[PDB]
Structure formats: C-alpha cells, structure tokens
RNA sequence: GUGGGAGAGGGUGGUGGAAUUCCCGGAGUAGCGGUGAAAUGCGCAGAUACCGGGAGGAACGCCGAUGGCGAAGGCAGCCACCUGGUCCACCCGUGACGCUGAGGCGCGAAAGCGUGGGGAGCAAACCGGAUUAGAUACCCGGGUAGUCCACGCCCUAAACGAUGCGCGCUAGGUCUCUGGGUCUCCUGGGGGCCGAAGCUAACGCGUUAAGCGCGCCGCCUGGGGAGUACGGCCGCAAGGC
C-alpha cells in the first residue's frame, strides 16, 4: 500500500441534504476500494480561476489515504460517476520540497 | 432605438482588413463598420487610414443609439490595429479600458503552408 | 514491482551461507525473479519494445553466469537449474 | 526589478494547493514566468511548472488571462 | 547487495484548458476573404465580426533551455497503474564470471500497402482563379488518398557527430545538468565552449580524440555506365538486401 492524496471539487450549490449524501457516497466508495483515511481537509467555497461547468466557484475536498495501488484508476472511475462530482485528481503523496530555506 | 449608452467595442485587425464591432455589455452587437463598408475596396482596407475611418464610422453609428462609455477589445495584429484605437479615444466616446484578447492556440491545429 | 521484502526472501533462500549477497547462485536467483516479473508484464503490453530490450540483457546476463557455473562446479549448476526450473 | 524568490519566505514548492504564493509566479497573463524573473534554480523551476499545471486543472490557477493595456 | 537519486525512457487507461471547423439560438447589416495587385470562392436562404450553448477530431502555449531521457529511430498537457535503463554513497558479497561480435533473432522517422474504423485542421493527385511569352510551378480559393487509432506487412534516409564498440593513458580554464561531500570549493557521471603536447592535406580535433596504444567486427581501391542488368533471398504490391 502506497499513500495518495485525493482532490474532489463538486457543485457549490448543494444544501445539507445533498452535501451529506454526496460526501457519504464518497465515504462508501472508499470503503469498497480499501482506502484507510489518514486525515481530511475541507476548504469548501473557493473562487475558481475559470468557469467549471458554467459555475464560477467550486466546493473543495482533500483526503489523504493509504490503499493498494492497483485499484486507484478504478476508484477514480467510481468518483466521476456522480453528477455533482466535477473534478477528481489523485496524486501520489510526495515530500514537501522546500525552496528559499 | 436601443439607448444603451455603454458597451463593448471589438477590433478585429488583420493584415488584409480591420473591422470594428460595437456591442452592449452582454456581447450582443449594435452597429459595425469595416474597411469595405467605407469606400475602400481592395488592399486599401488593411491600411491605418481605413482602420481609422472604419472605427469612426461605427462610433457615429453608436451615437445614434446614444453610446457614451466604451470598453475596447482588440484581436489580431496588423496595420491599423493601433490607428483604430487612437481614432476611438478621440471619437467622442469616452474610452473606459482597453484589453487585448487575441486568441492564441496551444498548438492544436496545423496551420496552412503560409504560416509555417 | 519488486519490494525489498520479496528481495530478502530470495537472497536468504539461495545464499551459500549467512551474509552472502553476491554468490553466482544468488545473482541468478535475483535475475530470474525479474525475468518472471517482466515476462508476465510482456504477455500483456506486447507493444512495449523498450522494456523488451532490458529483458534480453537480463537473459544474456543470466546465461552468462550459468555458463560460468557450468565450467567451475557442474554439481551446484544442476542443483540450481533444478531448483529454478530452467533449460 | 526584484525576483520572486528574493521577496518571499520559506515555502513548499510541491504544494499545488497554495494559490496565494503561486499567483506570485504567474505573469499578468496566466503564463508561467521564466527563470530570469522568478530567481529559481534549474530543479526548482521544473518542479514549479508541474505544480502550477496541477493547480490549473483544479481551477485554482488560470490557464490564460486578458492583458489590460495597449 | 544495501540505501538514495534525476528523467518529454517505454506501455495501458483515464483526464484538462486554449484554439480551428461544424450545428443550435440570441443579436446584427453589406460584404467577407484573399494578394505585389487582383480574380475564382463565399454572402439576402442574412455570411464575416460579437455573446451563449453543444458536437467532434487532432495537437499540447507559457514552463522550454545553447536542457533532460534513450542503443539508435526517437520521446513534450496532466493523473494513475505496469515498467526499462542509468547514476552516486557504503567497500558488504561472488572471484576473471571480461571485450568485441560473421550469422541468427528483435527494434527501426516519414512515406507507401492490406483489413476495419475515424475524419476537425492540413493536404499529393485533381478541380478552379491568377501570374506569364507559356504555368504541366512558386502566390490564391476549393479538395481525395493520406496524416490519427487498432491489427498485420513494408526494412529504406543527410537513419549525421557524414566520426563502430570497449579499455587504458595524455596540461588546464570556463559554462552547465545531476548526485555526494569536511558545501570560497573538492570529488564523480553526462551535456557545451576555448585551448597544452601531439595528430591532420587543410578546415579543424584536442580527458565526450580525429592524440598515444591495444583487441574485435563492418567497409574502401578512379568517374560515367550503375545501385543498373542477371541470379538468389525476402515482399500482397510498391520495392528492399
Ligand atoms: Mg461528473
Ligand atoms: Mg484586403
Ligand atoms: Mg514517461
Ligand atoms: Mg508515456
Ligand atoms: Mg446562426
Ligand atoms: Mg455569388
Ligand atoms: Mg448568393
Ligand atoms: Mg447563392
Ligand atoms: Mg463530426
Ligand atoms: Mg519553445
Ligand atoms: Mg535526430
Ligand atoms: Mg525507475
Ligand atoms: Mg571487498
Ligand atoms: Mg572480499
Ligand atoms: Mg574470498
Ligand atoms: Mg555487447
Ligand atoms: Mg548483427
Ligand atoms: Mg519502419
Ligand atoms: Mg508511417
Ligand atoms: Mg491505410
Ligand atoms: Mg485548406
Ligand atoms: Mg492548395
Ligand atoms: Mg517570363
Ligand atoms: Mg492561364
Ligand atoms: Mg565520405
Ligand atoms: Mg578505427
Ligand atoms: Mg551539494
Ligand atoms: Mg545521453
Ligand atoms: Mg565533464
Ligand atoms: Mg601546436
Ligand atoms: Mg585524418
Ligand atoms: Mg575545439
Ligand atoms: Mg578514446
Ligand atoms: Mg557494400
Ligand atoms: Mg569503372
Ligand atoms: Mg535504390
Ligand atoms: Mg548471373
Ligand atoms: Mg531481382
Ligand atoms: Mg514472390
Ligand atoms: Mg527505390
């Protein structure tokens, strides 16, 4: 198992009934693919640099997990299925390379 | 018959012609002119004089609809691309701002033999 | 790929003695494992030709060490080939 | 002119999510500054280019912008 | 072996924005386009220019470099999986296990061929417009095969560093990529520029040798005829050795 970082941006117009559903759906998808969650950072409403899906903002999520490597691309396929889910980018974790130290 | 009094003005300047369109803040055009709308016919349209007269013809057409404030957009390089702007500032229309939005691709399509 | 967990498993199995890391038997074992990792990677991905080159270099090196073992001590050569299922 | 690394602190060059600092490395347009203007090293600029492209796909850094002059 | 390291190295899938074309709507009149000038072309069935939305294919701007990777061909969005090569620190292990390499086998830009897809842009042939003494061309408008993908052939090149490979030896200075180090620097492995000795017909090369040596393979012996004829092998063909 390697360690990855998940970036999810969904439609920033959801109420709490839809936001809890979309997010607990992301929880259920991680359980089926064996993603041990290490920490979570939720930014939320953030000003986008260009329109995405005709919408000028986006609700941001970030998960750091440890999972088997072979199932990553099938996990990316499972997240983009949801309509509200718009951006899915999974990056292998890396060390914080410093500059001007 | 519109009474807009404010809007955008696009300048599409090529090496073969310079053409000006005047619109409203949403993008929909009001009037327009070019090097061919005025008497010039051939290569004379890609000249700075034609670029000046075309800019001023559209400006007087926008006065009919009551235009005072004007935001300027410019696309393309060519003779008279600057002479049209300089004509537009002294056209009575108080020029609000000037933006260059010339579309540059990310090397997506293969150009004609001319451009290679 | 090939983690150091699986690596130590092979070295300790084919070592002539504790601490031995570079015996000819140990080199051929390690070479053979990467052969089977690539030959299975080349069953699929049949159009990967740059990886195909590295496999020829490993086969040439594996046969280079076996041809050496054949000359010096032919017994350990047979005990090695029978243990890896080659030739 | 000053350079970006000269007027800055100790920052993470691999953090694609820190837009406040990565906006410093973009020009007036969405373009990426050359090394002459960022004051970075060879290896640093290569990492910055990749982490900027990541932020671009996350809607955080603009692909291209509009120049207000001329 | 151990521990680290950089990378358009490769293969597979996924994915992002810009732009071109086309469709839909909104708005909007008289031309746009193109050239040294023009004309064919397109436009009142409403184009060009502008806003919004959609479809599709192909190529990845800036970063980008005189840079990096690869045995060569060659490899540029991003993400992930699979994966090759290579380099450095430790001085740990085996104990000459090495070098080259006629055949063989595998790879091999583009173009072309077969089968089936795909088809936005570009574009042989070809259809036109000009130029011209003429235009079987450069310039202009259209446009098919093809360029893209899958599978199978084809084996050529300015396939270039016009420099086969490996090793040892022979002043340095300077720019650089990437490691390690007691980090004005030293020490490696590549990528450039000047230049000692020396070589070379000269231009020029010069620790990345074209220098001094050694091992092995390939090849050369006047031009035209001619990379043609015959024969053979290979190929569906074009044709290749
Ligand atoms: Mg979706
Ligand atoms: Mg003209
Ligand atoms: Mg790669
Ligand atoms: Mg690749
Ligand atoms: Mg329409
Ligand atoms: Mg007509
Ligand atoms: Mg008509
Ligand atoms: Mg008609
Ligand atoms: Mg179509
Ligand atoms: Mg460039
Ligand atoms: Mg080349
Ligand atoms: Mg690797
Ligand atoms: Mg020793
Ligand atoms: Mg020893
Ligand atoms: Mg001993
Ligand atoms: Mg060899
Ligand atoms: Mg051979
Ligand atoms: Mg070929
Ligand atoms: Mg081809
Ligand atoms: Mg074909
Ligand atoms: Mg064309
Ligand atoms: Mg043509
Ligand atoms: Mg003549
Ligand atoms: Mg004629
Ligand atoms: Mg010669
Ligand atoms: Mg020689
Ligand atoms: Mg250092
Ligand atoms: Mg190299
Ligand atoms: Mg060097
Ligand atoms: Mg001399
Ligand atoms: Mg000579
Ligand atoms: Mg020199
Ligand atoms: Mg030498
Ligand atoms: Mg010959
Ligand atoms: Mg003769
Ligand atoms: Mg020939
Ligand atoms: Mg004969
Ligand atoms: Mg023959
Ligand atoms: Mg035959
Ligand atoms: Mg021929």
Swiss-Prot record, chain A:
GO terms for cellular component: cytoplasm; ribonucleoprotein complex; ribosome. One of its GO terms (molecular function) is small ribosomal subunit rRNA binding. Keywords: Ribonucleoprotein, Ribosomal protein, RNA-binding, rRNA-binding. GO terms for biological process: translation. Signal peptide: none annotated. It holds the Pfam family Ribosomal_S6. Gene3D superfamilies: 3.30.70.60. Located on the outer edge of the platform on the body of the 30S subunit. Part of the 30S ribosomal subunit. Forms a tight heterodimer with protein bS18. May make transient contacts with protein uL2 of the 50S subunit during translation. Belongs to the bacterial ribosomal protein bS6 family. HAMAP family: Ribosomal_bS6 (MF_00360). This is Small ribosomal subunit protein bS6. It comes from Thermus thermophilus (strain ATCC 27634 / DSM 579 / HB8).
Curated annotation (Swiss-Prot), chain B:
GO terms for biological process: translation. Residues 99-116 are annotated as: Disordered. Residues 109-116 have a biased composition (Basic residues). Located on the upper part of the platform of the 30S subunit, where it bridges several disparate RNA helices of the 16S rRNA. Forms part of the Shine-Dalgarno cleft in the 70S ribosome, where it interacts both with the Shine-Dalgarno helix and mRNA. The keyword Phosphoprotein does not apply. One of its GO terms (cellular component) is ribosome. It comes from Thermus thermophilus (strain ATCC 27634 / DSM 579 / HB8). InterPro entries: Ribosomal_uS11, Ribosomal_uS11_bac-type, Ribosomal_uS11_CS, Ribosomal_uS11_sf. It comes from the Bacteria. This is Small ribosomal subunit protein uS11. The lineage of its organism: Bacteria, Thermotogati, Deinococcota, Deinococci, Thermales. Pfam families: Ribosomal_S11. Keywords: Ribonucleoprotein, Ribosomal protein, RNA-binding, rRNA-binding. Part of the 30S ribosomal subunit. Interacts with proteins S7 and S18. Binds to the C-terminus of IF-3; however exactly how IF-3 interacts with the 30S subunit is unclear. May contact the C-terminus of Era. Belongs to the universal ribosomal protein uS11 family. GO terms for molecular function: rRNA binding; structural constituent of ribosome.
UniProtKB/Swiss-Prot annotation, chain C:
Signal peptide: none annotated. The keyword Ribosomal protein applies. GO terms for cellular component: cytosolic small ribosomal subunit. It comes from Thermus thermophilus (strain ATCC 27634 / DSM 579 / HB8). The lineage of its organism: Bacteria, Thermotogati, Deinococcota, Deinococci, Thermales. It holds the Pfam family Ribosomal_S15. Keywords: Ribonucleoprotein, Ribosomal protein, RNA-binding, rRNA-binding. GO terms for biological process: translation. One of its GO terms (molecular function) is structural constituent of ribosome. It comes from the Bacteria. Part of the 30S ribosomal subunit. Forms a bridge to the 50S subunit in the 70S ribosome, contacting the 23S rRNA. PANTHER family: RIBOSOMAL PROTEIN S15, BACTERIAL AND ORGANELLAR (PTHR23321), SMALL RIBOSOMAL SUBUNIT PROTEIN US15M (PTHR23321:SF26). Belongs to the universal ribosomal protein uS15 family. One of the primary rRNA binding proteins, it binds directly to 16S rRNA where it helps nucleate assembly of the platform of the 30S subunit by binding and bridging several RNA helices of the 16S rRNA. InterPro entries: Ribosomal_uS15 (IPR000589), Ribosomal_uS15_bac-type (IPR005290), uS15_NS1_RNA-bd_sf (IPR009068). This is Small ribosomal subunit protein uS15.
From Swiss-Prot, chain D:
Coiled coil: none annotated. Signal peptide: none annotated. The keyword Transmembrane does not apply. Disulfide bonds: none annotated. GO terms for biological process: translation. Located on the back of the platform of the 30S subunit where it stabilizes the close packing of several RNA helices of the 16S rRNA. Forms part of the Shine-Dalgarno cleft in the 70S ribosome, where it probably interacts with the Shine-Dalgarno helix. Belongs to the bacterial ribosomal protein bS18 family. This is Small ribosomal subunit protein bS18. It comes from Thermus thermophilus (strain ATCC 27634 / DSM 579 / HB8).
